[PDB]
Amino acid sequence: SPEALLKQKLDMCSKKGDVLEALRLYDEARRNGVQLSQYHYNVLLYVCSLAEAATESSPNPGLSRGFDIFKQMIVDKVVPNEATFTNGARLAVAKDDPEMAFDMVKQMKAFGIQPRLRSYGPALFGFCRKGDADKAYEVDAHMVESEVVPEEPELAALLKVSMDTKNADKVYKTLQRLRDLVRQVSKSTFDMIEEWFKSEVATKTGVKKWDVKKIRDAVVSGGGGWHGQGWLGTGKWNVKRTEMDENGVCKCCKEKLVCIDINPVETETFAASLTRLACEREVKANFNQFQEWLERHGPFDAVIDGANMGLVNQRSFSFFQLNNTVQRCQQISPSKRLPLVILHKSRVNGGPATYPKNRALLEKWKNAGALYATPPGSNDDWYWLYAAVSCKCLLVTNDEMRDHLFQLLGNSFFPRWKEKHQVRISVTREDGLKLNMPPPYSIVIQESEDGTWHVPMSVEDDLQTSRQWLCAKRSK
């Protein structure tokens, strides 16, 4: 079979790295009238990726013909799958011609194909590296039109190019996008924002007087913690690295940060999504059985990730730590409700039930309507997440909630929900176990009604490391 033979020959051509032969075989298939499929085209795009950009001579056939091959695949109406977008992007990155990368995205659109975020990268980053703001803004407008949402690296590049070209309005808009989409910024974005506020352009941008009514109304309209009406005040910024105390008060200027509400409609949308996702991955009957059980139980003030409470910072499962956490949650519940403990059935009858009084206590919690033992093969994370979301209550876990399945939950609603609901344990020698409660304010870039900015840095563990903030306040 000829298409099956080209497959075999391109699979081999190449783990070897032979681009000149992959390009010979491509040309030969077309002289034989053998139709290249999705698989052939993808292998071919990957292999052309390995060509490198010629620093001395004019461009090599591998990269150069790679764009031709991509163009043809679309013309042929062969459907791109995830490997197509990845190899297409690798090729774009290797060539490092932002104009050619942007051409690839324009032709996807012309043929009704949805570009991916990684398709836009080599174009956007290419123009930003060249200081070409006008072209970077075109790419960004194109992304926005295709409903592709930028992440921090795209926003940071747009921020830097706006700073380089002295564009105060684009800086303002990008900073609002950082607030909306990212919330807390990486070290390098933080340093960038600090440079902005100390800069000459920042010093010289702003308004001495403004419609205070219009600001107040924008604050209500936006949901809280920003107004979006432009730079306010005049003159030099005082720009300090600082911290918030436990109540959200800036140690530099004493502004108390806002606690930003979550709209209950967004929460119900998210609960539906969460249920859909869990049922796609769990045995549906297992997850449904839990849903039905939960409808018949509670009320709950807290849901505990039992495996995480037994295991975090432990050489092996610690019933002491789980039980202490149960007792502590019950103590802080205004009506002394036991928390809902989610644990694997294998744990309810294995290592945590090793000692008879522990086993009797696990059974007592179950009999109090405060424990659900998830079935063999289940991923407990769906169960404790759904319970805390559904009961609108505290979620006790030290799980980071960022890898694997948690990526499916998105990077807007879920991080906001997590901040308001997640309780983590910490331990010290002097005191024992502590429950660390949600903050009374929102850890997000905030813009005050008078134009003052507070920008939080992102950190791995804000209980381990004290989170730094930037305070930017006009000196006059």
Q: Does 381 carry a binding-site annotation?
A: yes
Q: Does 253 bind Zn ion (CB under 5 A)?
A: yes
Separation of alpha carbons 81 and 43, rounded Å = 12
By CB under 5 A, the count of residues binding Ca ion is 4
Choose between 398 and 448: whose C-beta lies nearer to Zn ion. 448
Of 140, 152, 381, 447, the one binding Ca ion by CB under 5 A:
381
Q: Is the peptide bond between 299 and the residue preceding it cis, with omega within 30 degrees of 0? A: yes
Choose between 255 and 449: whose C-beta lies nearer to Zn ion. 255
Q: Does 282 bind Ca ion (CB under 5 A)?
A: no
Choose between 85 and 237: whose C-beta lies nearer to Zn ion. 237
Q: Does 399 carry a binding-site annotation?
A: yes
Choose between 164 and 461: whose C-beta lies nearer to Ca ion. 461
Q: Does 132 carry a binding-site annotation?
A: no
Choose between 21 and 194: whose C-beta lies nearer to Zn ion. 194
412's CB contacts (< 8 A; 6+ apart) are: 180, 181
Least separation in angstroms between CB 343 and Zn ion: 44
Each residue 305-334 as x (binds Ca ion by CB under 5 A) or -, in order, gives: -------------xx---------------
Q: Does 215 bind Zn ion (CB under 5 A)?
A: no
Query: In the range 254-293, which residues lie near Zn ion by CB under 5 A?
Result: 255
Region near Ca ion per CB under 5 A, out of 55-63, 90-98, 99-107, 366-374 = 366-374
Q: What is the DSSP string of 187-252?
A: HHHHHHHHHHHHSHHHHT--BS---HHHHHHHHHHHTSS---S---B-SPEEEEEE-B-TTSBBTT
Q: Does 380 carry a binding-site annotation?
A: yes
**Cβ count within 10 A of residue 131:** 12
Residue with the closest Cβ to Ca ion? 319
Q: Does 6 bind Zn ion (CB under 5 A)?
A: no
Q: Does 470 bind Zn ion (CB under 5 A)?
A: no
Where b means 16+ CB within 10 Å and e means fewer, 207-220 reads eeebeeeebeeebe
Q: Does 472 bind Zn ion (CB under 5 A)?
A: no
Choose between 115 and 456: whose C-beta lies nearer to Zn ion. 456
Let me know: does 221 contact 162? Beta carbons within 8 Å. Answer: no
**DSSP secondary-structure letter at 426?**
E
The item of Ca ion, Zn ion, none sharing an interface with residue 369, based on CB under 5 to 8 Å by kind, is Ca ion
Q: CA separation (Å) from 84 to 13, 39, 75, 153? A: 18, 9, 14, 22
Separation of alpha carbons 404 and 214, rounded Å = 43
Residues that bind Ca ion (CB under 5 A): 318-319, 369, 381
Extract the annotated binding site for Mn(2+).
305, 380-381, 399
